Amino acid sequence: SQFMNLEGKVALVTGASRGIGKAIAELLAERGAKVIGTATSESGAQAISDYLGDNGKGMALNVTNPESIEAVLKAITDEFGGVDILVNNAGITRDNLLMRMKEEEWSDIMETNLTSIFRLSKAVLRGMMKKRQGRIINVGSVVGTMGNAGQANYAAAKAGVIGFTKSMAREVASRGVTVNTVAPGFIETDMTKALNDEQRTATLAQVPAGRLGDPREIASAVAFLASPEAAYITGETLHVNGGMYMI
Amino acid sequence: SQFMNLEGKVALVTGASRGIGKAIAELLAERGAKVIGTATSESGAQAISDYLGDNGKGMALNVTNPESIEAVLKAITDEFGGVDILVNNAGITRDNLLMRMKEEEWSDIMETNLTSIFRLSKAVLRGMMKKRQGRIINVGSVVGTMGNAGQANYAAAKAGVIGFTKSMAREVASRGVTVNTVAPGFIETDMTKALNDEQRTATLAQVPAGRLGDPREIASAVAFLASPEAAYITGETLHVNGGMYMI
Amino acid sequence: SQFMNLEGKVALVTGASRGIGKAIAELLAERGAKVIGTATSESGAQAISDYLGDNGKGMALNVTNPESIEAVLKAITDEFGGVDILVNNAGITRDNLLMRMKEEEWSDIMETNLTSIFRLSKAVLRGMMKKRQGRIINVGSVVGTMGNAGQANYAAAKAGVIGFTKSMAREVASRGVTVNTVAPGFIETDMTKALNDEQRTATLAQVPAGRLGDPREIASAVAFLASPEAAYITGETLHVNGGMYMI
Amino acid sequence: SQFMNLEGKVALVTGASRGIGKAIAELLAERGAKVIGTATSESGAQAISDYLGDNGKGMALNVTNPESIEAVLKAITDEFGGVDILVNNAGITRDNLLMRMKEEEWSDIMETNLTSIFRLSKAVLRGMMKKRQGRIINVGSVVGTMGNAGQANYAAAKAGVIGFTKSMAREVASRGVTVNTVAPGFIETDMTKALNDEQRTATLAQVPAGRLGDPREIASAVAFLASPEAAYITGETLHVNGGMYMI
Ligand SMILES: [Cl-]
Ligand SMILES: [Cl-]
Known part of the structure; x- marks a missing residue:
């Protein structure tokens, strides 16, 4: 139907080889988007091409590397036209109580979970503004x-994503580009599957739904x-x- | 498709003869819901039946009257089965600066915009909990x-809707009933159409989108x-x- | 010193015979305010006068009765001058899961915990605006x-207090009157003292401080x-x- | 008096040579704290020593340099004992619309306004936890x-400060250390004094108080x-x- 129909849109979903990123890429494709999903390695990129088939493709992308960002986007633009939807889903954890938290655990989280959004958003925004149409959606x-x-590092980067979102939203609203964050709770993934029974039950104790998200x-x-419809x-x-x- | 498909669901939308409430009722019907929309009068009820056709019907409902509530719901339940989706959209304004605000302008707002949500939510919750499935959505x-x-009266009632929503969400989450609020900004309606140019331009100055919502x-x-999908x-x-x- | 010095200010604290309301009244007096604390009865009023001594007095006040409100304020104004600081602390609970919650348990909460703030705020605002100086502080x-x-009733009223507070804050900011809410968590009081061990330990499990507030x-x-300093x-x-x- | 009395506390206030940081350092001193305020240069450090006199001293501190942080703290600890209160006020702006925003303008903001908090908080937390008493307050x-x-950069760092605050608050609450953020609006400073009349009036248009903060x-x-009292x-x-x- 005409309802939530993304035919004619080109979507870039980072970190799309599994879990949430994969689900996003599949659903956007199912709603009619041409989807480019990314992974850190070529084998992930290929797995992405494999599940997308004729609806898009996989590319290798290092979200902490400007050169990689410039190359991936050029290839998208060359083939598909400008990106209409950017989903920033690439992200990592480097957990530790503060007194155990290394300089590198902090900085790697900032680079991968926050600075990446600044770089990727910047790389796509110009075309969106010229077309007077765009979506940037950050998975927080x-x-x-x-x-x-x-x-504390993960929390700081993910809260930072919101301050960025709100500022960019203000900057580009008049040009028909929206900027928003989706903030998952405890979603069933490989990482949550590796947790022991005690850890999962403990976390479920804090979810009134009494289950993990899909x-x-x-x-x-x-x-x-x-x-x-979300304009x-x-x-x-x-x-x-x-x-x-x-x- | 199977995406956001409400076939098999019975939805009650209050205040559905025009604007937002009408739009809600029409969209829920288009996604497959059997929809009962309400109005304060029989002529409004009829206009509701007219636009819904075979997808539902209009009923006269006084949201500040327990007897009306009981009668409308009995009719719905008799014909359609228990309500799966309640949208509380009925509401009014009684604007005034505090020093000009009458006792009745405060109390009418509280009754219509907040106590109604208590009554209608209470009237539908039991069946939702027994079925282990439900949606209550408040238009704030x-x-x-x-x-x-x-x-200040309208703000108080609408903020009250959120405290109610959070508490009810906690009460019924484990039973598969969600409780949420949709909070419109400046939406093009009859009320906003009656505003003069100065007033509309002044309000648009505070919207980065630079337009009224639809x-x-x-x-x-x-x-x-x-x-x-929103479970x-x-x-x-x-x-x-x-x-x-x-x- | 000159720091947080309330000499010259007249403060009205509702629900001041014990606990939080008493603590508020005693502290405002200690910082130099002339304090009128209220209770529902004359014996409570007297207990208030007893602890305030030369720094203020107790009065009997029914916050759900306009006539009581008018009489208490006239007395204050006659003796002390207009109220500079209003603390709305009077409030009650009428707890129940929604399906057990009586019409009267909802309406009594709304009247006592929300409509009271409308009435009392309205009764003091005029003098605050003329003087270009005031504080209204709601205990949420x-x-x-x-x-x-x-x-759900208590939550709705307390959330309502915030919508009211924000709207009034906007209405009167240019005239040097502030409007704010203090939102206590689990504070040691008679009510919390009556809780059993299981209930208190359960609630403390959700407080990182691992204690009740004072x-x-x-x-x-x-x-x-x-x-x-909070202007x-x-x-x-x-x-x-x-x-x-x-x- | 005994009210908000900081005698016996050692406070470290970063970025304290002027404006907000200076006001903080002076007020903490006035309430009885021994205060160490910092600046980027020795001449600023000296100006800080000059206004603090016998209540504390100025030190040169590079908040983006671990070595500087380690040296400044050792000197404090040697002379005064462990820091009891940390105020993170050091901060900068590097404004630009996203499409004009340099890599370095982003990264410098992250380093100075967010990573600094991680480093300084980490450097002081251990002593606070062992003493079961501390305050970390971030000027957001x-x-x-x-x-x-x-x-967008400044917003991201300042929002990041909140995510960090909330996580650290959870981490250390049971040990009597609080972590909080103060979030100024438009405060009169050298930077706001350099704005032209149009810019100031425009910004005042968005402040209901109708004036800048002090x-x-x-x-x-x-x-x-x-x-x-804020424990x-x-x-x-x-x-x-x-x-x-x-x-
Ligand atoms: Cl409404
Ligand atoms: Cl209360």
């Missing part, structure tokens, strides 16, 4: 809003914000956390 | 979060939250305001 | 921001906002909850 | 919460949070913005 975290012990549930919120939403943080936190 | 306002001079844009955010969103306030405010 | 609750199961800690936050704080909600919730 | 900005066009008003909020406040953002934004 409940931890950005809630805070969490042992994750990656497809984050994907749905992303495709919603990516849609023409009047900007500078927003959409929380998908089973009631873990309520703002 | 940016004013509830931002505040606005000359609207009622359909509010409808889309409600339909999204009403969908199966992991609860206790949330979804702002649809063109950047007027950013939380 | 973490529950207004967080939500809580079994307290009424004096709420008093200090109110005295701070009441001070000249540039308005429309704000000051959370004093030991980390129970973080916004 | 309304722009962290509101966003602002042309300041540095002493930020200082008051800082000394309040630094006090024993039950942690993970909070205290907004001092004349109503410019209302959360």
Whole structure:
């Protein structure tokens, strides 16, 4: 139908070889977008090409490297036209209580989870503004809003993503580009699957929904914000956390 | 498709004869819901039946009257089965600076815009909890979060809707019922159409989007939250305001 | 010293016979304010006069009765001059899960915890605006921001206090009147003392501070906002909850 | 008196040669703290020693240099004992619309306004935790919460400060260390004094207070949070913005 239809849009989803990033890339494709998903290695890139088939392709992308960013985008633009939707999902954790937290654990989190957004957003914004149409959607975290012990770095970067989102939203609203954040809670992934029973039960104790989120549930919120129907939403943080936190 | 498909769901949308409430009712019907929209009068009810056709019907409902509430719901339940989706959109304004604000202008706002949500939510929750499935979505306002001079009553009620929403979200999350608020900014409606040029330009000065939202844009955010895909969103306030405010 | 000095200010503190309200009244008096504290009965009023001594007095006040409000304020104004600082602390609970919550338990909460703030604020604002100086400080609750199961009425009223506060803050900021909310978490009081061990330990599990707050800690936050030094704080909600919730 | 008395506390205030940082250092001293204020150069350090006199001293501190941080703290600890209060006020701006924003303008803001907090907090936390007593207070900005066009970097760092604050607050609450942010709005400083009439009037148009803040008003909020009386406040953002934004 004409409802949340992304035919004619070109979407770039970073960190799309598995879990949330994969779900996003698949759902945007299913809604009609041409999707370029990225991974850190070529084998991941290939896995992305494999699941996307005729709806898009996989590329190798180092989100902390300007040269990689410039090369990946040139290839997209050459083949598909300018990016209409950017989903910043690439991200890592380097957990530790502050007194154990290395300089590199802090800086790597800042570079990968916050500075990347600045670089990638900057690389796509010009075309979006000239076309008077765009979506930038950042995959944040409940931890950005809630805070969490042992994750001061991750929390700082993810909260930073929101300050960036709000400022960019103001900057580009009049030109028809929205900028928003989706903030997952505890979503079932490989990382959460590796947790032991105690750890999972403990975390479930803080989720009124009494279960973990599915990656497809984050994907749905992303495709919603990516849609023409979400044009009047900007500078927003959409929380998908089973009631873990309520703002 | 299977995406945001509301076939099999029964939706009750209050205050549905025009604008936002109408847009909501029409979109939920288009996504497959059986929709009962309400109005204060039988002529409004009929206009509702007229636009819904085979997808639902209009009923006369006084949201400040328990007897009306009981009668409308009995009729729905008899014909359609229990309500799966409640959208509380009925609401009014009684604007005045505090020193001019009558006792009745305060109390009418509280009754219509806040106590109604208590009554209607209570009237539908039992079946939702037994079925282990439900959506309650309140149409709030940016004013509830931002505040606005000359609207301390409206702001209080709309902010009250959020405290109610969070508490109910916690109460019923484990039973698969979500409770959320959609908070419109400045949406083009009859009320906003009656504003003079100065007033509209002044208000647009505070919207980075530089336009009024469309009622359909509010409808889309409600339909999204009403969908199966939104099962992991609860206790949330979804702002649809063109950047007027950013939380 | 000249620091947070309230000499020359007249403060009205509702619900001041014990706990938080008493602590507030005693601290404002200690910082130099002439303090009128209220209670529902004459015996409470007397207990208030007894602890205030030469720094103020107790009066009987029914916050849900306009006639009582008019009479108490006339007395204050006659003796002391216009009220410079209003602290709305009077409030009650009527807890129940929604399906057990009586019409009267909802309406009594709305009247006592929200409509009271409308009435009392309205009754003091005119003199504050003419003098181009004033403080209105509402004692809210973490529950207004967080939500809580079994307290949807209380949450709604306390969240309503914030919408009212923001709107009034906008209405009167240019005239040198601030309007703010102090939002206590779990504070040691008679109510919390009556809780059993299980209930207290369960609630302490959600407080990172690992203790209940003291009424004096709420008093200090109110005295701070009441001070000249706080002239540039308005429309704000000051959370004093030991980390129970973080916004 | 015994009210907000900081006798026996050792306070480190970064960026204290002028404006807000100076006001903070002076007020903490006035409330009885031994204060070490810092500046980037020795001449600033000397100016700080000059205004502090017998209440403390100035030191040269490069907040983006671990070696400088280690040397300044050793000297404090040697002379005064462990730091009890840390105020992170050192900060810069590197404004530009995103498309004009250099890599270095982004990174310098991240390093100076966010990574510094991680380094300085880490350098002081151990002693605070062993003593079971501490205050870390970060001077943020309304722009962290509101966003602002042309300041996406500043907004991101200042929002990042909050995510860090909330996480650290959780980490150390049980050990009697609070962590909080004070978020100034438009405060009169050299930077705001250099603005032209149009720019100032434009910005005042967004402040309901209808004036700029004074540095002493930020200082008051800082000394309040630094006090024993604020022990039950942690993970909070205290907004001092004349109503410019209302959360
Ligand atoms: Cl309404
Ligand atoms: Cl209360």
